[PDB]
RNA sequence: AGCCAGGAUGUUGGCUUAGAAGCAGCCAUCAUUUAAAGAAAGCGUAAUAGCUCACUGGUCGAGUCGGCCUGCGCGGAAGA
């Protein structure tokens, strides 16, 4: 529980409305809300944010550490946002952005016309590349995984929607 | 150079001894001399932790009882069959 | 070279030229069977070879015990 | 497998298997396999247990077997009604009591001794433990 | 995946975790080492 | 002098300036042309005699110019002929041939000094008398 | 325990040198210093390079690692 004790710093331009157990973050990139667990205590500071395993259940040290890094994920979300780069490796793969939907040509005999959730924007500077932009690490984490869910990389040449920071675990083709 | 904490046990017997070893303590006996023997009870945990050394069996063991500390030698160890504990030790008063 | 090891390839070494990496080795005749069918299966059809005779060298224990009918 | 050469009788009464055991200390080598459960060991499991741990060290050190089958356990043949006489002896067992020193060995390093006994124990129907020779 | 009633940590990177109450072993390097139910 | 992308730490024969199939896999990995490299090799090759093995380090610059800082006999290959025989091992503790002194090797440590400057004159000899210990040889003075 | 600098390797060490360069494994098990360094486990590999591992030289700043004896629970556990 080193991360349960470690306070979340709130730098300038960021507003934290500690209203009971539902906490709303607010900053440079909008505003998000998140309800916390009742095993977790909350106090602001002079400027930072310190949380505690509130009395009652004794497993709050396990709980507040989860409750800490969530807000530590949220405080960076409304200051910089986050972004997952992708690679659409494979000949015959493109993707374009029509406002909020993505038209993925994945070698299927039906167009993959996938629509994103709200609060995120996509960027396709290269047709085999996808730059998702959003606030939460959670919401863009799933979207990148749902994009991988259409064509997961096969371990022979890695044809798929692999991450640009992930190395694919290709094996030997080993036969004819 | 080992030291043993112990005391005199009373009301001995079969079930009496079985009542002891289910309470983290076990009996013993000290004999040898022109006197009467001494049925001495001593802590189980402490002496079992120190019986691993060879100096537990090659030294004048310094058992203290009611203030009076005596130097004895370890004759035999009647230990538990399959559990790693032990049941009884014979201390000849050397 | 690694697949040549499975074909008992007594290697010599690795040499290079202007666009090719030439490697000469000794291979048993018993494991010559369909070699270029397995060669260009591993080299994308861009390789070649030529078989020449050297000697009736030693047949090991597993290879000596096989053909005895 | 181990079997008594020239015993007195052909069959023997069943008999309960109570009490404790006599072989308790690691009396010959340094590392033994004391038994914690209470059952019986036929000769086939006796032969198989040594075999697995003999090849665990492959030759190394002396290995002593402290249990020998004495009880001639019989079985009746199938489709035969009860009675009609005691059945013929099929296999020989050694009744195991709690705190019995089974297989014992010497001349091997400790860590592989516990390893070799671990390979042997899974062939046994009795829960055992790895015990070490103490002084006296 | 191997539904083996015993599970052994077969490598260095093989980690043992309890998912949904069931003990599961996964590996970062070798996907042949995945197993459960132990 | 670039850190790892092309540096090769091996060679055997000075007089045999041709890289035989034993040596060739290292040159073919990056494409080192030995023929004009032999002319640069033979400037220092002629300074030493043949019969004592020589290694090389290889440095390739960014502009396809490739050079080297070659050697003289280092640690293993000089102590072998110092014993008289190039080999005779596979059994360090199980064989015992010859007895060599360190004062005579203190002179050849200075010949290794201008070649492969291995630390602490006698402790480098103590690193290779361990090799003499591992070649089955014995050393006593 | 991580993060950056690392991998303190003489030794392309025999050998079988076609290579077994710490890593084919038999062996010596030498030594440099011995503030961070075994003449070596491991996939990877023709063989080096390799990323590491043993180990943290500086960063942070508190407790921590694995067995033993056991109380109570889980999985093992599929029938008309």
From Swiss-Prot, chain A:
Keyword RNA-binding: yes
Matches recorded under InterPro entries: Ribosomal_uL6-like, Ribosomal_uL6-like_a/b-dom_sf, Ribosomal_uL6_a/b-dom, Ribosomal_uL6_bac-type, Ribosomal_uL6_CS
Record Gene3D superfamilies: Ribosomal protein L6, alpha-beta domain
Keywords per UniProt: Acetylation, Antibiotic resistance, Ribonucleoprotein, Ribosomal protein, RNA-binding, rRNA-binding
UniProt function note: This protein binds directly to at least 2 domains of the 23S ribosomal RNA, thus is important in its secondary structure. It is located near the subunit interface in the base of the L7/L12 stalk, and near the tRNA binding site of the peptidyltransferase center. Gentamicin-resistant mutations in this protein affect translation fidelity.
Quaternary organization: Part of the 50S ribosomal subunit.
The name this protein goes by in its record: Large ribosomal subunit protein uL6
Organism: Escherichia coli (strain K12)
Swiss-Prot record, chain B:
Entries under Pfam families matching the protein: Ribosomal_L25p
Keywords, in A-Z order: Ribonucleoprotein, Ribosomal protein, RNA-binding, rRNA-binding
Chain segments annotated as coiled-coil in the UniProt record: none
GO molecular function, one term: 5S rRNA binding
Top-level division of the source organism's lineage: Bacteria
GO cellular component labels: cytoplasm; cytosol; cytosolic large ribosomal subunit
GO biological process entries: cytoplasmic translation; negative regulation of translation; response to radiation; ribosomal large subunit assembly; translation
Subunit structure: Part of the 50S ribosomal subunit; part of the 5S rRNA/L5/L18/L25 subcomplex. Contacts the 5S rRNA.
Record family assignment: Belongs to the bacterial ribosomal protein bL25 family.
Protein purpose: This is one of the proteins that binds to the 5S RNA in the ribosome where it forms part of the central protuberance. Binds to the 5S rRNA independently of L5 and L18. Not required for binding of the 5S rRNA/L5/L18 subcomplex to 23S rRNA.
PANTHER family recorded: RIBOSOMAL PROTEIN L25/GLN-TRNA SYNTHETASE, ANTI-CODON-BINDING DOMAIN-CONTAINING PROTEIN (PTHR33284), RIBOSOMAL PROTEIN L25_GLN-TRNA SYNTHETASE, ANTI-CODON-BINDING DOMAIN-CONTAINING PROTEIN (PTHR33284:SF1)
Name this protein carries in UniProt: Large ribosomal subunit protein bL25
Taxonomic source organism: Escherichia coli (strain K12)
Gene that produces this protein: rplY
Swiss-Prot record, chain D:
Species, as recorded: Escherichia coli (strain K12)
Record's comment on post-translational modification: Is hydroxylated on Arg-81 by RoxA. The modification is nearly suppressed when E.coli is grown in anoxia.
One Pfam family it belongs to: Ribosomal_L16
Gene Ontology CC terms, in alphabetical order: cytoplasm; cytosolic large ribosomal subunit
Keywords assigned by UniProt, alphabetized: Hydroxylation, Methylation, Ribonucleoprotein, Ribosomal protein, RNA-binding, rRNA-binding, tRNA-binding
Keyword RNA-binding attributed: yes
Function: Binds directly to 23S ribosomal RNA and is located at the A site of the peptidyltransferase center. It contacts the A and P site tRNAs. One of the last ribosomal proteins to be assembled in the 50S subunit. The simultaneous presence of uL16 and bL36 probably triggers ObgE's GTPase activity and eventual dissociation from the mature 50S ribosmal subunit. It has an essential role in subunit assembly.
(3R)-3-hydroxyarginine carried by residues: 81
One BP annotation, GO: cytoplasmic translation
Modified residues (N-methylmethionine): 1
Record family assignment: Belongs to the universal ribosomal protein uL16 family.
PROSITE patterns for this protein: RIBOSOMAL_L16_1 (PS00586), RIBOSOMAL_L16_2 (PS00701)
Molecular function terms from GO: rRNA binding; structural constituent of ribosome; tRNA binding
Listed name of the protein: Large ribosomal subunit protein uL16
Lineage: superkingdom: Bacteria
Record note on quaternary structure: Part of the 50S ribosomal subunit. Cross-links to the A and P site tRNAs. Interacts with assembly factor DarP(YjgA).
UniProtKB/Swiss-Prot annotation, chain E:
GO biological process, one term: cytoplasmic translation
InterPro entries (alphabetical): Ribosomal_bL36, Ribosomal_bL36_sp
Stretch forming the signal peptide: none
One annotated GO molecular function: structural constituent of ribosome
SUPFAM superfamilies noted in UniProt: Ribosomal protein L36
Source species, domain of life: Bacteria
Record's GO cellular component terms: cytoplasm; cytosolic large ribosomal subunit
Keyword entries, A-Z: Ribonucleoprotein, Ribosomal protein, RNA-binding, rRNA-binding
Family under the similarity heading: Belongs to the bacterial ribosomal protein bL36 family.
Function: One of the last ribosomal proteins to be assembled in the 50S subunit, it contacts a number of helices in the 23S rRNA, acting as molecular glue. The simultaneous presence of uL16 and bL36 probably triggers ObgE's GTPase activity and eventual dissociation from the mature 50S ribosomal subunit.
Complex and partners: Part of the 50S ribosomal subunit.
HAMAP family noted in UniProt: Ribosomal_bL36
NCBIfam families associated with the record: rpmJ_bact
UniProt protein name: Large ribosomal subunit protein bL36A
Taxon lineage: Bacteria, Pseudomonadati, Pseudomonadota, Gammaproteobacteria, Enterobacterales
Record gene name: rpmJ
